[PDB]
A paper describes a structure:
The Microrchidia (MORC) family of chromatin-remodelling ATPases is pivotal in forming higher-order chromatin structures that suppress transcription. All MORCs share three features: an N-terminal gyrase, heat shock protein 90, histidine kinase and MutL (GHKL) ATPase domain, a central CW-type zinc finger (CW) domain, and a divergent C-terminal domain (CTD) with predicted coiled coils (CCs). MORC2 possesses multiple DNA-binding sites that undergo structural rearrangement upon DNA binding. Importantly, MORC2 mediates chromatin remodelling via ATP hydrolysis-dependent DNA compaction in vitro, regulated by the phosphorylation state of its CTD.
To determine how phosphorylation of MORC2 affects DNA binding, we purified a MORC2 phosphodead (MORC2PD) mutant comprising S725A, S730A, S739A, S743A, S777A and S779A mutations. We determined the structures of MORC2PD and MORC2 ATPase domain with (MORC2PD-DNA, MORC21-603-DNA) and without DNA (MORC2PD, MORC21-603), in presence of AMP-PNP, at overall resolutions of 1.9, 2.5, 2.4 and 3.2 Å, respectively, using cryoEM. The dimerised ATPase domain is well-resolved in all the cryoEM maps, but no density is seen for CTD to model in the full-length MORC2PD, MORC2PD-DNA and MORC2S87A maps. Surprisingly, MORC2PD hydrolysed ATP ~ 2-fold faster than MORC2WT at kcat of 0.11 ± 0.03 µM ADP/min/µM, and addition of DNA did not alter MORC2 ATPase activity. To assess the DNA binding activity of MORC2, we first performed EMSA showing that MORC2PD mutant binds better than MORC2WT. Surprisingly, both the lag time—measured from the point of flow injection to the onset of DNA compaction—and the compaction time—determined by exponential fitting of the cluster intensity increase—were approximately three times shorter for the MORC2PD mutant compared to MORC2WT, indicating that the MORC2PD mutant compacts DNA three times faster than the wild-type. Our data also shows that the phosphodead mutant compacts DNA three times faster than the WT, correlating with its two-fold higher ATP hydrolysis rate and higher DNA binding affinity.
Numbering used by the authors:
A (entry chain A): 5 to 307, 343 to 514, 519 to 551
B (entry chain B): 1 to 307, 309, 343 to 510, 519 to 528, 534 to 551
The structure:
Amino acid sequence: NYSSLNRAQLTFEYLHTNSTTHEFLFGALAELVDNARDADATRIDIYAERREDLRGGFMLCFLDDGAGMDPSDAASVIQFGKSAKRTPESTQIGQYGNGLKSGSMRIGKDFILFTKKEDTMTCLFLSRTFHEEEGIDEVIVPLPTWNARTREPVTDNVEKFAIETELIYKYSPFRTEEEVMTQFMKIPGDSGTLVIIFNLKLMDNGEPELDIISNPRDIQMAETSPEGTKPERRSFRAYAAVLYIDPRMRIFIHGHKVQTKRLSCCLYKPRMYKYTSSRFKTRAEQEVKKAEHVARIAEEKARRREADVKKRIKEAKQRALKEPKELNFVFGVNIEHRDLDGMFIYNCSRLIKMYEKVGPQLEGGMACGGVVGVVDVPYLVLEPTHNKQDFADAKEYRHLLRAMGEHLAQYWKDIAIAQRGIIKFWDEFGYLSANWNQPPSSELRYKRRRAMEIPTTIQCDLCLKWRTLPFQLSSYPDTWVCSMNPDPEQDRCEASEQKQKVPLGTFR
Amino acid sequence: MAFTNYSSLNRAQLTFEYLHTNSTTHEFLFGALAELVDNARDADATRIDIYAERREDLRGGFMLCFLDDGAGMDPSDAASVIQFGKSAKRTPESTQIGQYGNGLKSGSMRIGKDFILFTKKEDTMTCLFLSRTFHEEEGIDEVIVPLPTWNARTREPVTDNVEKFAIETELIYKYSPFRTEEEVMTQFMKIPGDSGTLVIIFNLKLMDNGEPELDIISNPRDIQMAETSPEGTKPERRSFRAYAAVLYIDPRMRIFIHGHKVQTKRLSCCLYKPRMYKYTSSRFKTRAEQEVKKAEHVARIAEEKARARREADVKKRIKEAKQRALKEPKELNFVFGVNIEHRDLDGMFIYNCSRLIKMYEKVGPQLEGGMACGGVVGVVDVPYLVLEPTHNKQDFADAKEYRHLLRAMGEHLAQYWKDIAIAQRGIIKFWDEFGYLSANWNQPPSSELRYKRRRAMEIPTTIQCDLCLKWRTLPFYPDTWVCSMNDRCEASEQKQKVPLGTFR
Ligand SMILES: Nc1ncnc2c1ncn2[C@@H]1O[C@H](COP(=O)(O)OP(=O)(O)NP(=O)(O)O)[C@@H](O)[C@H]1O
Ligand SMILES: Nc1ncnc2c1ncn2[C@@H]1O[C@H](COP(=O)(O)OP(=O)(O)NP(=O)(O)O)[C@@H](O)[C@H]1O
Ligand SMILES: [Mg+2]
Ligand SMILES: [Mg+2]
Ligand SMILES: [Zn+2]
Ligand SMILES: [Zn+2]
């Protein structure tokens, strides 16, 4: 028994250190939103309440309507590394068990959670202000929980509970149970989660690190975003918009829907290439071997259904000796924004690499300028970094970027817009200036032309079924639902999805 | 802490899956190596020998070993290398690399699956066995880091819990390259002095084809990446020989890769026209004032509590030092310099308290495609008041302040570029006279005698001693050298003077 041996233990300065992985602050926010997706949320509202008594002048909230957490899955949040999402297929962004703790501490000193599921509403209050003011060396994470209906406590150790709630009412924006329950009641359904991040990182000037004052319908960099700063890194509304390859969920920043995007739908000629990346034909076999030998490990530890689950993964991975033997590179040219380009690498539906230039994009020029990648990389091909803004296995990752370079050139010469004239193509979509970062002209003809080539896709508000409208309203223009959809078959709420047909290209 | 008994309260805990996640911060594998050798420098190391043996019984066929002669660790400082975040190197007027208490545990696990430490200090011989093969084979969820320690002289166990020691050594002999006490002791005695650190990283992750992740066989004197050599690929990201060479701003350290000294180079004063631009970043006086306002203030807060008293004297000693932080550290030490030995190995070598945190991070004009400031290896000991590293210690945490600092060095990189007036005096002609006769920016400089000697004149030919390790600049052998070959051991440390630069 390995009970007396020393264990690695977190410390206060490790919270700072782990947050330091997030040089990308909207990446830090994006991790908390990823967890909301992994709870199968349909909405994730990201309003920021205005409390000036705290540092930063406000609180950064993440409301959602998903499958939240039970107290066990709440305690699994502070178990660094632990991700219960580990399971067959199951996009489930969380694999590393460290994105929320990584991000909420890059975002501000403190953070308070208000998850909810079934008949439980767990709170997860981790505050570095408490730690600094009381001299904490470890990582003390208050974990109080109440009942979803009665809003009465659900926890074994009452003294622990009292300490947790006392710290919440001592450092949190919410100085009593009444305001904490108000925050809980913001969760409209019987399951969901509200993550607030408070005592926010003050910039060198004194303002918080996140602006909610310049645009009250958005969370932006309080740093003056210098020109080249992309919306996704200067607006978490943009990041949440493009945060997933298949967002079956809506984002309400400041009570205002983000027009979320699959990023495969909203592109010009979204051609999908079934490529074995050269290596992934080898890492299809090793993927079969990985699922086989680890199912053998699953059998060894079992020596039962967990091995059977992993054995069915192995035969499902021997089926992935065809199906995920090749990565789905959904290349497409972003005509809405030319400069917001580069392979949007989705490691199982989470944007890890945004604006990563590969292939002809690495060398300067119009070669593959504009092309968005939208690859749904599984966690078998490759895994992200600690910050989930780079990729861990840099060897296999450079190999995947090289493979996407070959097939990005393939997509480039298959659509052949450069042969027809890349500059003329861009002129056809509003861009008639020299600077590559110049947004498209608001000119009517170019707006219509962009709206046409883009399959005008829009989620619903009840069933969330992505349709292909002849028009656009919204859902910051007016809202929309399937029932008001003017289309003969795609009008019923229960009508089958019309998930985008992808014209597949061929190499060589 | 307890105060109101937070012991009951849920503490955040690390897991085996977090060992992988932590290693994933190191997408950069020689960055993972650099973390261990940084800790060696934090030991005040004279030598760090980095030898890669041949062990076919293990995964990868070899073990990556990190021998040094520094101050090593004691049992307490060893247990501190698994207190994630804990870093006793956190001090004012910092010269160490340690802030984040996580470079060994982040890097040994990126490097390879498992890893075993050995280290020496005073009369202790401590081991930090942390093997992930162990966790994978016996189904361990929590990070379990075996901690055996021996006496440096008697080779006798020194540990409170003897059954714990037995389990630690048993795991070492189960998964480590070294079975039985004798082979572990043989590894210990490689530490030549009475203090040092031998970290071995073994059972490597393997490149997908089955080779180890670190090729030592292509060059038996080096640890190369088990990966090809693209045209665009730095030797520092292709060879830890090169990385450990350029890893420190003040390398009072020789580095012996495969028992062969690396020519560690002060990028402060090993280039053409080094210039010390003392710039306040347009922020640093404010950031230093903010830190002087903060650290002095929080010093009172901790001193108020200890006014218990060790922290109060420490905080008072910090606070007075933080009053001197208002004067001496007001302008960032930007040591700009044009690297003539390798022009393609350029961009600001962003050091940070004597550790290369952001290697090859092009700023300013270098971010813009062209020859503007191409070759200028900017070198700045960014103190721990201005900026702090990232989790991987390959970026910087505060991205706003980092971008502002890079914009500041872009401004003063343009300033340095015009002051030397190298582009004015035909940057193409400059590179032509210093070896490079190709439009290819990667193409290494020509090896003709005239051009090599011409590069030798500009570079002060600097070589480190092997006895007192006093840097010397012998008048104009190349791998072994001592002070009495120039001009003597007792000579004072003569640091190459740098012409100070001023903006506008
Ligand atoms: N806002 C949230 N809504 C719902 N579930 C959440 C939320 N935040 C965290 N969780 C859950 O709590 C756990 C911890 O999240 P996190 O620390 O992000 O680890 P992970 O999501 O498992 N992995 P990663 O996404 O790599 O960090 C997860 O297993 C999620 O299921
Ligand atoms: N080779 C070594 N020589 C001496 N001390 C060491 C060595 N390796 C680790 N240590 C000690 O262990 C501490 C923790 O190491 P580590 O986990 O790398 O964090 P850190 O070195 O404090 N910070 P960083 O490495 O910059 O993230 C060091 O600060 C030293 O006190
Ligand atoms: Mg996640
Ligand atoms: Mg270190
Ligand atoms: Zn509907
Ligand atoms: Zn000497």
